[PDB]
Amino acid sequence: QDELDVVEGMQFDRGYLSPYFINKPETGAVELESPFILLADKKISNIREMLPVLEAVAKAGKPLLIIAEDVEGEALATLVVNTMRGIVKVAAVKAPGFGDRRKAMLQDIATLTGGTVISEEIGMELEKATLEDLGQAKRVVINKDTTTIIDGVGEEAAIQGRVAQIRQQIEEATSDYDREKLQ
Amino acid sequence: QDELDVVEGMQFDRGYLSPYFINKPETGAVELESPFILLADKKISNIREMLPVLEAVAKAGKPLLIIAEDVEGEALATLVVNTMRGIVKVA
Amino acid sequence: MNIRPLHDRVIVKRKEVETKSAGGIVLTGSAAAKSTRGEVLAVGNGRILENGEVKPLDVKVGDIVIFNDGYGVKSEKIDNEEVLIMSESDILAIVEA
Amino acid sequence: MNIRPLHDRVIVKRKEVETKSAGGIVLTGSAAAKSTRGEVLAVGNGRILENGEVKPLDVKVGDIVIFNDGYGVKSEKIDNEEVLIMSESDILAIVEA
Amino acid sequence: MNIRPLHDRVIVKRKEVETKSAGGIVLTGSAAAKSTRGEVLAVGNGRILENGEVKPLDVKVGDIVIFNDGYGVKSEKIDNEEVLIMSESDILAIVEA
């Protein structure tokens, strides 16, 4: 029989890495209340250098979300321990796509949440991190295989400029698949 | 239908290097208002040496354009940060 | 909690890592470098070498000092703050007033 | 069982391996690092250099010392507990009061 | 803002990188070389070594000095100008009159 699936808001593949931290519901899916979002271009290894960020949230109380190509074992260790002790609630997810595409979506995530993209390929390092660069949302839920953002507080005008520019990037290139990914 | 496009005033190949910087219009293409242009014979890597130039622009506020064989990643980093933060608009 | 270096050793705290001031408003990227400035917070008695008692150091507690980040420079955590420990030999000059 | 260091050498006991105080409640994993804080348990006579008898060292038994885990640093087991043996040169500072 | 070197250390400012004097009117290019001439801006008290008090160095502020651009020479920014910091050991000669 024919089946129709419909995905509303922001949702895509790639779930969390460590199932050890969990929230109020079951099924493994983790929901956050007025969540905090961070995004990165490269992977990471040290965790102490993340002091200026994490501590800030520890002064804010708001739960955190992390986006990168990957996150190493000790980072998940600190994160899972800290979430288990209940001082700070954090989740981590590997980058969605590859090369230029993952970045091309990282910009839209940044603009949709309202924050600004951080990139190692740009002068700003993983060290240099401010409370303006990090994004904010109303609620986000991430399960084993898929991640979902429901509502970013980022204004619609920014989204307008972005959908404009992306559709402009659509009005070229041959084959379909490419146009399809852009769509 | 047949359409004629006409470009007035100097046009040639080779576009921008970093699509990271954008202006008021879309397409990634940047337009500049009463811009200043610099031209060089060699390549570049350092960014501090542009003091006598950038400072002038930092005293003017008006946007700059640069021409060389190429400009390296770290310079693209400094410029993209400066254009994104909105301190000075340069291509 | 205050600390006490053991002769010849000086404990200073770093300021801002590569203070963004180039051009005046322009943000400089990272050229794999750091900052060499600091502020003296703790000072040992002095160098013990050459037997003859212990000769005091020429750096007083509270000085804004410019140094060289050599090999003898070590890092430590006091009161959950990052501090650096060095010798007078690694210290180059002092900024006054 | 008490031990006896031979002049200029200081024997101290390590504290907690990377004492968890980062952030205040955040537990850091192991980044191939150790602890640099300890408490002095045994002290040698003093430095032997410059012939002129033996001048005692400036660290007394019972001092809480912060040191550098250099190359001269060795580990030993006494009464089935892990203790550390080093020199006065490798010792940096003392926490007082 | 004036600076103050701490003993044995000398702070001098470099002149022009490869001073244009080749031929008399010919402008020399860069052969991966630098300038070896400079002007001393600040001088420390003197060498502290050898215990016996502190003997002053033989370079006074205002001498035109030729040095060697070794490893111990460091660069700094004072009053938004590039200055060089070295020791008395690395400086080669002084041109007088």
Side-chain angles (χ1 to χ4, degrees):
Chain A
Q1 296 279 79
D2 308 325
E3 306 171 331
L4 175 139
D5 288 327
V6 46
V7 168
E8 286 190 10
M10 182 68 184
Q11 169 179 343
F12 61 100
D13 41 318
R14 145 239 206 172
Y16 52 75
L17 274 65
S18 178
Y20 281 98
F21 58 92
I22 199 45
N23 51 331
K24 303 155 187 176
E26 216 242 351
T27 325
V30 172
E31 171 102 295
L32 295 183
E33 194 88 340
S34 181
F36 220 75
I37 139 95
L38 176 59
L39 51 95
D41 179 29
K42 281 303 176 181
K43 307 114 186 175
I44 36 81
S45 63
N46 45 13
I47 65 102
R48 174 70 163 170
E49 88 298 349
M50 294 287 92
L51 191 140
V53 196
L54 279 52
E55 275 195 353
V57 336
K59 294 179 71 67
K62 301 191 286 167
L64 178 67
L65 195 153
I66 311 183
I67 302 287
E69 283 181 355
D70 199 23
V71 282
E72 217 67 284
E74 84 300 300
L76 283 346
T78 60
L79 274 201
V80 161
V81 169
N82 286 334
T83 312
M84 188 73 180
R85 296 310 178 75
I87 54 156
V88 278
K89 304 167 186 180
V90 189
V93 283
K94 300 171 50 65
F98 291 93
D100 298 341
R101 176 149 161 71
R102 59 157 63 100
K103 305 173 182 178
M105 55 187 59
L106 276 185
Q107 56 171 243
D108 70 53
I109 297 176
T111 51
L112 183 141
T113 182
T116 198
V117 50
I118 125 94
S119 179
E120 181 270 330
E121 302 178 343
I122 318 186
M124 54 179 59
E125 287 178 347
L126 54 160
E127 243 29 85
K128 187 53 186 53
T130 50
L131 279 303
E132 182 171 19
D133 310 336
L134 28 86
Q136 305 175 332
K138 276 192 174 60
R139 46 185 305 172
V140 302
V141 21
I142 308 180
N143 57 276
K144 293 188 69 175
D145 44 331
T146 124
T147 167
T148 66
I149 305 174
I150 288 190
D151 203 340
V153 84
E155 56 173 356
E156 302 162 21
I159 293 173
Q160 164 187 15
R162 183 174 42 89
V163 66
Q165 167 188 7
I166 300 174
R167 285 186 162 180
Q168 277 296 319
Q169 297 182 354
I170 291 180
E171 293 166 345
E172 281 187 353
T174 51
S175 313
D176 293 338
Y177 182 59
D178 202 343
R179 290 175 181 177
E180 177 179 7
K181 293 184 310 177
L182 281 186
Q183 282 189 9
Chain B
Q1 294 83 352
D2 308 325
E3 56 174 335
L4 174 55
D5 193 342
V6 46
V7 17
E8 75 291 32
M10 179 67 184
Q11 169 181 83
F12 61 168
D13 40 318
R14 316 305 175 181
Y16 51 18
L17 276 67
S18 298
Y20 283 89
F21 57 77
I22 332 177
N23 213 241
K24 297 91 181 180
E26 58 189 358
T27 326
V30 279
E31 305 182 347
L32 295 80
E33 47 178 359
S34 181
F36 275 55
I37 168 74
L38 176 59
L39 7 78
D41 279 26
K42 281 208 317 188
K43 310 183 192 72
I44 37 82
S45 63
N46 200 346
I47 332 99
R48 55 191 65 103
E49 86 297 348
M50 292 176 189
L51 192 73
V53 197
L54 64 94
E55 277 281 41
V57 168
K59 295 179 73 67
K62 65 194 327 175
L64 179 67
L65 193 59
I66 312 182
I67 296 180
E69 282 66 17
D70 64 335
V71 37
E72 279 298 331
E74 75 290 339
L76 282 2
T78 59
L79 73 87
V80 161
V81 168
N82 285 246
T83 52
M84 188 74 180
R85 295 310 178 76
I87 306 158
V88 53
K89 305 166 187 180
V90 188
Chain C
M1 172 97 297
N2 194 20
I3 20 77
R4 187 84 326 179
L6 279 117
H7 70 67
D8 164 76
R9 302 298 182 177
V10 187
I11 304 120
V12 11
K13 256 103 292 180
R14 182 71 215 95
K15 284 186 61 179
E16 307 171 0
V17 181
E18 289 180 312
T19 71
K20 170 202 70 65
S21 57
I25 326 181
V26 359
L27 176 47
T28 21
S30 184
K34 212 195 61 160
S35 178
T36 52
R37 198 116 315 115
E39 183 191 345
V40 175
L41 293 169
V43 172
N45 304 282
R47 198 176 283 99
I48 55 177
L49 203 59
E50 207 80 3
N51 196 322
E53 302 176 281
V54 176
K55 287 216 164 64
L57 312 180
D58 301 29
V59 243
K60 297 195 76 71
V61 172
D63 285 331
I64 156 184
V65 51
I66 157 182
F67 57 74
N68 175 78
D69 197 279
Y71 292 59
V73 178
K74 296 310 170 179
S75 182
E76 197 58 34
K77 303 178 183 179
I78 281 83
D79 304 349
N80 200 73
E81 200 176 7
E82 185 58 68
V83 312
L84 47 88
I85 308 177
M86 59 200 314
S87 176
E88 199 203 356
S89 307
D90 296 319
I91 295 181
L92 287 189
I94 299 175
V95 173
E96 295 173 327
Chain D
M1 177 86 69
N2 284 331
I3 200 60
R4 185 78 36 182
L6 278 166
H7 69 67
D8 174 78
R9 305 299 181 178
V10 189
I11 306 180
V12 320
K13 55 169 53 177
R14 187 74 66 73
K15 284 187 172 176
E16 305 173 0
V17 44
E18 289 180 312
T19 299
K20 223 55 264 312
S21 57
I25 330 99
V26 166
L27 287 82
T28 301
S30 184
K34 66 200 78 171
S35 178
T36 51
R37 294 172 181 269
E39 184 190 345
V40 176
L41 59 101
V43 168
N45 304 282
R47 198 176 186 175
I48 55 177
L49 204 59
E50 207 79 3
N51 195 84
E53 302 176 281
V54 276
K55 287 216 164 184
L57 46 159
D58 301 29
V59 42
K60 266 53 246 181
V61 174
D63 286 331
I64 305 100
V65 291
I66 59 106
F67 55 79
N68 174 78
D69 197 279
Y71 295 90
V73 175
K74 293 210 174 184
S75 182
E76 197 58 34
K77 303 178 183 179
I78 58 108
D79 303 349
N80 201 73
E81 84 192 341
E82 47 180 358
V83 304
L84 200 137
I85 304 179
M86 59 200 314
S87 62
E88 198 203 355
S89 307
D90 296 319
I91 297 181
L92 284 68
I94 300 174
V95 173
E96 295 173 327
Chain E
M1 177 87 69
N2 283 331
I3 200 168
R4 187 79 180 99
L6 278 168
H7 68 66
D8 173 78
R9 303 298 182 178
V10 188
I11 305 180
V12 320
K13 202 180 72 63
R14 189 185 288 262
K15 46 159 53 178
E16 30 187 349
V17 45
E18 70 250 313
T19 300
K20 35 164 294 169
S21 308
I25 325 98
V26 168
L27 287 295
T28 164
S30 295
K34 301 295 192 54
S35 178
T36 52
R37 294 93 183 292
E39 182 68 20
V40 49
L41 297 167
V43 169
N45 303 282
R47 296 188 181 181
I48 62 276
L49 294 177
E50 301 145 4
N51 84 84
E53 303 176 281
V54 41
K55 176 173 185 174
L57 52 146
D58 301 29
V59 167
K60 296 196 170 181
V61 174
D63 283 331
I64 359 175
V65 52
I66 312 175
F67 55 69
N68 175 78
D69 198 279
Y71 63 94
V73 46
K74 294 309 288 184
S75 183
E76 198 57 34
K77 303 178 183 297
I78 281 83
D79 303 349
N80 69 254
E81 200 176 7
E82 183 180 349
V83 306
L84 279 74
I85 304 179
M86 59 199 58
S87 62
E88 199 203 355
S89 307
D90 56 65
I91 48 183
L92 191 98
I94 302 174
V95 280
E96 294 173 327

PDB file of all heavy atoms in Angstrom, chain A residues 46-69:
ATOM      1  N   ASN A  46      40.180  18.113  23.333  1.00  0.00           N
ATOM      2  CA  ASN A  46      40.198  18.691  24.674  1.00  0.00           C
ATOM      3  C   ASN A  46      38.810  19.154  25.113  1.00  0.00           C
ATOM      4  O   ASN A  46      37.961  19.458  24.277  1.00  0.00           O
ATOM      5  CB  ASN A  46      41.191  19.852  24.745  1.00  0.00           C
ATOM      6  CG  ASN A  46      41.079  20.789  23.559  1.00  0.00           C
ATOM      7  OD1 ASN A  46      40.120  20.725  22.791  1.00  0.00           O
ATOM      8  ND2 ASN A  46      42.058  21.674  23.410  1.00  0.00           N
ATOM      9  N   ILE A  47      38.579  19.194  26.422  1.00  0.00           N
ATOM     10  CA  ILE A  47      37.288  19.629  26.950  1.00  0.00           C
ATOM     11  C   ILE A  47      37.397  20.800  27.927  1.00  0.00           C
ATOM     12  O   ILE A  47      36.441  21.554  28.106  1.00  0.00           O
ATOM     13  CB  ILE A  47      36.546  18.467  27.642  1.00  0.00           C
ATOM     14  CG1 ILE A  47      37.310  17.996  28.879  1.00  0.00           C
ATOM     15  CG2 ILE A  47      36.337  17.318  26.671  1.00  0.00           C
ATOM     16  CD1 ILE A  47      36.732  18.499  30.186  1.00  0.00           C
ATOM     17  N   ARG A  48      38.559  20.947  28.558  1.00  0.00           N
ATOM     18  CA  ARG A  48      38.791  22.043  29.497  1.00  0.00           C
ATOM     19  C   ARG A  48      38.755  23.402  28.810  1.00  0.00           C
ATOM     20  O   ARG A  48      38.283  24.386  29.381  1.00  0.00           O
ATOM     21  CB  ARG A  48      40.131  21.850  30.212  1.00  0.00           C
ATOM     22  CG  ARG A  48      40.558  23.007  31.108  1.00  0.00           C
ATOM     23  CD  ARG A  48      39.698  23.140  32.356  1.00  0.00           C
ATOM     24  NE  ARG A  48      40.352  23.972  33.364  1.00  0.00           N
ATOM     25  CZ  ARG A  48      39.767  24.411  34.473  1.00  0.00           C
ATOM     26  NH1 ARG A  48      38.497  24.121  34.717  1.00  0.00           N
ATOM     27  NH2 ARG A  48      40.446  25.160  35.332  1.00  0.00           N
ATOM     28  N   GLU A  49      39.213  23.441  27.564  1.00  0.00           N
ATOM     29  CA  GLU A  49      39.240  24.680  26.795  1.00  0.00           C
ATOM     30  C   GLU A  49      37.828  25.176  26.500  1.00  0.00           C
ATOM     31  O   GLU A  49      37.633  26.326  26.112  1.00  0.00           O
ATOM     32  CB  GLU A  49      40.021  24.484  25.494  1.00  0.00           C
ATOM     33  CG  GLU A  49      39.193  23.980  24.319  1.00  0.00           C
ATOM     34  CD  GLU A  49      38.593  22.612  24.559  1.00  0.00           C
ATOM     35  OE1 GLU A  49      38.986  21.952  25.542  1.00  0.00           O
ATOM     36  OE2 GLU A  49      37.759  22.181  23.738  1.00  0.00           O
ATOM     37  N   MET A  50      36.846  24.300  26.689  1.00  0.00           N
ATOM     38  CA  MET A  50      35.450  24.663  26.482  1.00  0.00           C
ATOM     39  C   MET A  50      34.876  25.335  27.725  1.00  0.00           C
ATOM     40  O   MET A  50      33.664  25.525  27.836  1.00  0.00           O
ATOM     41  CB  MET A  50      34.620  23.432  26.114  1.00  0.00           C
ATOM     42  CG  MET A  50      34.972  22.822  24.766  1.00  0.00           C
ATOM     43  SD  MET A  50      34.427  23.795  23.348  1.00  0.00           S
ATOM     44  CE  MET A  50      35.873  24.808  23.035  1.00  0.00           C
ATOM     45  N   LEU A  51      35.758  25.678  28.659  1.00  0.00           N
ATOM     46  CA  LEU A  51      35.372  26.379  29.880  1.00  0.00           C
ATOM     47  C   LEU A  51      34.489  27.607  29.629  1.00  0.00           C
ATOM     48  O   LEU A  51      33.411  27.715  30.211  1.00  0.00           O
ATOM     49  CB  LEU A  51      36.618  26.779  30.680  1.00  0.00           C
ATOM     50  CG  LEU A  51      36.401  27.281  32.109  1.00  0.00           C
ATOM     51  CD1 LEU A  51      37.471  26.731  33.036  1.00  0.00           C
ATOM     52  CD2 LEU A  51      36.399  28.801  32.144  1.00  0.00           C
ATOM     53  N   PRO A  52      34.938  28.538  28.765  1.00  0.00           N
ATOM     54  CA  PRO A  52      34.172  29.781  28.608  1.00  0.00           C
ATOM     55  C   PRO A  52      32.744  29.548  28.125  1.00  0.00           C
ATOM     56  O   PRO A  52      31.870  30.375  28.384  1.00  0.00           O
ATOM     57  CB  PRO A  52      34.974  30.556  27.558  1.00  0.00           C
ATOM     58  CG  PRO A  52      35.711  29.512  26.801  1.00  0.00           C
ATOM     59  CD  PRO A  52      36.071  28.480  27.823  1.00  0.00           C
ATOM     60  N   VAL A  53      32.512  28.438  27.431  1.00  0.00           N
ATOM     61  CA  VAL A  53      31.175  28.120  26.947  1.00  0.00           C
ATOM     62  C   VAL A  53      30.360  27.379  28.001  1.00  0.00           C
ATOM     63  O   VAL A  53      29.365  27.900  28.505  1.00  0.00           O
ATOM     64  CB  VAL A  53      31.228  27.265  25.667  1.00  0.00           C
ATOM     65  CG1 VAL A  53      29.876  27.268  24.972  1.00  0.00           C
ATOM     66  CG2 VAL A  53      32.317  27.772  24.734  1.00  0.00           C
ATOM     67  N   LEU A  54      30.817  26.185  28.365  1.00  0.00           N
ATOM     68  CA  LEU A  54      30.071  25.321  29.275  1.00  0.00           C
ATOM     69  C   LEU A  54      29.769  26.006  30.605  1.00  0.00           C
ATOM     70  O   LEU A  54      28.621  26.028  31.051  1.00  0.00           O
ATOM     71  CB  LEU A  54      30.829  24.012  29.519  1.00  0.00           C
ATOM     72  CG  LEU A  54      30.728  22.906  28.463  1.00  0.00           C
ATOM     73  CD1 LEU A  54      31.066  23.411  27.068  1.00  0.00           C
ATOM     74  CD2 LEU A  54      31.613  21.727  28.837  1.00  0.00           C
ATOM     75  N   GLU A  55      30.794  26.586  31.221  1.00  0.00           N
ATOM     76  CA  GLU A  55      30.617  27.308  32.476  1.00  0.00           C
ATOM     77  C   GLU A  55      29.542  28.380  32.343  1.00  0.00           C
ATOM     78  O   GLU A  55      28.740  28.580  33.255  1.00  0.00           O
ATOM     79  CB  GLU A  55      31.934  27.928  32.949  1.00  0.00           C
ATOM     80  CG  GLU A  55      32.811  26.972  33.744  1.00  0.00           C
ATOM     81  CD  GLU A  55      33.917  27.684  34.499  1.00  0.00           C
ATOM     82  OE1 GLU A  55      34.080  28.907  34.306  1.00  0.00           O
ATOM     83  OE2 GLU A  55      34.625  27.019  35.285  1.00  0.00           O
ATOM     84  N   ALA A  56      29.538  29.073  31.208  1.00  0.00           N
ATOM     85  CA  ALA A  56      28.531  30.096  30.952  1.00  0.00           C
ATOM     86  C   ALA A  56      27.130  29.503  31.064  1.00  0.00           C
ATOM     87  O   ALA A  56      26.261  30.069  31.726  1.00  0.00           O
ATOM     88  CB  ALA A  56      28.741  30.723  29.584  1.00  0.00           C
ATOM     89  N   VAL A  57      26.924  28.348  30.437  1.00  0.00           N
ATOM     90  CA  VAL A  57      25.632  27.675  30.506  1.00  0.00           C
ATOM     91  C   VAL A  57      25.364  27.202  31.932  1.00  0.00           C
ATOM     92  O   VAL A  57      24.214  27.134  32.367  1.00  0.00           O
ATOM     93  CB  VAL A  57      25.539  26.488  29.516  1.00  0.00           C
ATOM     94  CG1 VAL A  57      26.518  26.674  28.368  1.00  0.00           C
ATOM     95  CG2 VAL A  57      25.775  25.160  30.221  1.00  0.00           C
ATOM     96  N   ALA A  58      26.432  26.902  32.665  1.00  0.00           N
ATOM     97  CA  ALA A  58      26.309  26.485  34.055  1.00  0.00           C
ATOM     98  C   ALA A  58      25.890  27.667  34.920  1.00  0.00           C
ATOM     99  O   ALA A  58      25.419  27.494  36.044  1.00  0.00           O
ATOM    100  CB  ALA A  58      27.616  25.892  34.554  1.00  0.00           C
ATOM    101  N   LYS A  59      26.065  28.871  34.384  1.00  0.00           N
ATOM    102  CA  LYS A  59      25.597  30.083  35.044  1.00  0.00           C
ATOM    103  C   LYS A  59      24.226  30.474  34.506  1.00  0.00           C
ATOM    104  O   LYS A  59      23.552  31.341  35.061  1.00  0.00           O
ATOM    105  CB  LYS A  59      26.591  31.228  34.845  1.00  0.00           C
ATOM    106  CG  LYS A  59      27.935  31.010  35.519  1.00  0.00           C
ATOM    107  CD  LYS A  59      28.880  32.169  35.250  1.00  0.00           C
ATOM    108  CE  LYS A  59      28.454  33.416  36.009  1.00  0.00           C
ATOM    109  NZ  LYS A  59      28.598  33.247  37.482  1.00  0.00           N
ATOM    110  N   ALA A  60      23.821  29.821  33.421  1.00  0.00           N
ATOM    111  CA  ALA A  60      22.549  30.116  32.772  1.00  0.00           C
ATOM    112  C   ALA A  60      21.508  29.055  33.114  1.00  0.00           C
ATOM    113  O   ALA A  60      20.325  29.358  33.261  1.00  0.00           O
ATOM    114  CB  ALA A  60      22.732  30.217  31.267  1.00  0.00           C
ATOM    115  N   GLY A  61      21.956  27.809  33.235  1.00  0.00           N
ATOM    116  CA  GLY A  61      21.067  26.708  33.557  1.00  0.00           C
ATOM    117  C   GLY A  61      20.437  26.073  32.333  1.00  0.00           C
ATOM    118  O   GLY A  61      19.904  24.966  32.404  1.00  0.00           O
ATOM    119  N   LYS A  62      20.491  26.779  31.208  1.00  0.00           N
ATOM    120  CA  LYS A  62      19.874  26.302  29.977  1.00  0.00           C
ATOM    121  C   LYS A  62      20.642  25.122  29.389  1.00  0.00           C
ATOM    122  O   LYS A  62      21.872  25.098  29.426  1.00  0.00           O
ATOM    123  CB  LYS A  62      19.790  27.433  28.952  1.00  0.00           C
ATOM    124  CG  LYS A  62      18.988  28.637  29.416  1.00  0.00           C
ATOM    125  CD  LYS A  62      18.723  29.592  28.266  1.00  0.00           C
ATOM    126  CE  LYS A  62      19.978  30.360  27.887  1.00  0.00           C
ATOM    127  NZ  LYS A  62      19.827  31.059  26.581  1.00  0.00           N
ATOM    128  N   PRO A  63      19.911  24.141  28.837  1.00  0.00           N
ATOM    129  CA  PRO A  63      20.501  22.911  28.296  1.00  0.00           C
ATOM    130  C   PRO A  63      21.209  23.167  26.971  1.00  0.00           C
ATOM    131  O   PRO A  63      20.773  24.036  26.221  1.00  0.00           O
ATOM    132  CB  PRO A  63      19.285  22.006  28.088  1.00  0.00           C
ATOM    133  CG  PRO A  63      18.161  22.955  27.854  1.00  0.00           C
ATOM    134  CD  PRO A  63      18.442  24.140  28.734  1.00  0.00           C
ATOM    135  N   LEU A  64      22.241  22.383  26.666  1.00  0.00           N
ATOM    136  CA  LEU A  64      23.094  22.654  25.512  1.00  0.00           C
ATOM    137  C   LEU A  64      22.983  21.575  24.435  1.00  0.00           C
ATOM    138  O   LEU A  64      22.689  20.417  24.727  1.00  0.00           O
ATOM    139  CB  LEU A  64      24.551  22.804  25.959  1.00  0.00           C
ATOM    140  CG  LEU A  64      25.607  23.050  24.878  1.00  0.00           C
ATOM    141  CD1 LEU A  64      25.416  24.409  24.224  1.00  0.00           C
ATOM    142  CD2 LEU A  64      27.006  22.916  25.457  1.00  0.00           C
ATOM    143  N   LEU A  65      23.223  21.971  23.189  1.00  0.00           N
ATOM    144  CA  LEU A  65      23.323  21.035  22.074  1.00  0.00           C
ATOM    145  C   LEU A  65      24.589  21.316  21.267  1.00  0.00           C
ATOM    146  O   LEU A  65      24.971  22.471  21.090  1.00  0.00           O
ATOM    147  CB  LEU A  65      22.084  21.145  21.182  1.00  0.00           C
ATOM    148  CG  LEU A  65      21.803  20.047  20.154  1.00  0.00           C
ATOM    149  CD1 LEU A  65      20.311  19.982  19.881  1.00  0.00           C
ATOM    150  CD2 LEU A  65      22.566  20.290  18.861  1.00  0.00           C
ATOM    151  N   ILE A  66      25.234  20.261  20.778  1.00  0.00           N
ATOM    152  CA  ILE A  66      26.497  20.413  20.058  1.00  0.00           C
ATOM    153  C   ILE A  66      26.434  19.830  18.646  1.00  0.00           C
ATOM    154  O   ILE A  66      25.825  18.785  18.419  1.00  0.00           O
ATOM    155  CB  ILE A  66      27.662  19.756  20.829  1.00  0.00           C
ATOM    156  CG1 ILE A  66      27.648  20.204  22.292  1.00  0.00           C
ATOM    157  CG2 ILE A  66      28.996  20.102  20.186  1.00  0.00           C
ATOM    158  CD1 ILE A  66      28.797  19.658  23.111  1.00  0.00           C
ATOM    159  N   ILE A  67      27.067  20.522  17.703  1.00  0.00           N
ATOM    160  CA  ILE A  67      27.097  20.095  16.307  1.00  0.00           C
ATOM    161  C   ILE A  67      28.526  20.130  15.770  1.00  0.00           C
ATOM    162  O   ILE A  67      29.152  21.190  15.737  1.00  0.00           O
ATOM    163  CB  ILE A  67      26.239  21.015  15.418  1.00  0.00           C
ATOM    164  CG1 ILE A  67      24.784  21.054  15.892  1.00  0.00           C
ATOM    165  CG2 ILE A  67      26.347  20.595  13.964  1.00  0.00           C
ATOM    166  CD1 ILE A  67      24.007  19.801  15.605  1.00  0.00           C
ATOM    167  N   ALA A  68      29.038  18.982  15.337  1.00  0.00           N
ATOM    168  CA  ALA A  68      30.353  18.936  14.702  1.00  0.00           C
ATOM    169  C   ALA A  68      30.497  17.725  13.786  1.00  0.00           C
ATOM    170  O   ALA A  68      29.581  16.913  13.671  1.00  0.00           O
ATOM    171  CB  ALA A  68      31.449  18.932  15.755  1.00  0.00           C
ATOM    172  N   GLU A  69      31.660  17.602  13.152  1.00  0.00           N
ATOM    173  CA  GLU A  69      31.967  16.432  12.338  1.00  0.00           C
ATOM    174  C   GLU A  69      31.989  15.179  13.204  1.00  0.00           C
ATOM    175  O   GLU A  69      31.518  14.118  12.795  1.00  0.00           O
ATOM    176  CB  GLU A  69      33.299  16.607  11.605  1.00  0.00           C
ATOM    177  CG  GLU A  69      33.217  17.525  10.394  1.00  0.00           C
ATOM    178  CD  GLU A  69      34.544  17.670   9.674  1.00  0.00           C
ATOM    179  OE1 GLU A  69      35.554  17.125  10.166  1.00  0.00           O
ATOM    180  OE2 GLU A  69      34.578  18.329   8.613  1.00  0.00           O
TER     181      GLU A  69
END
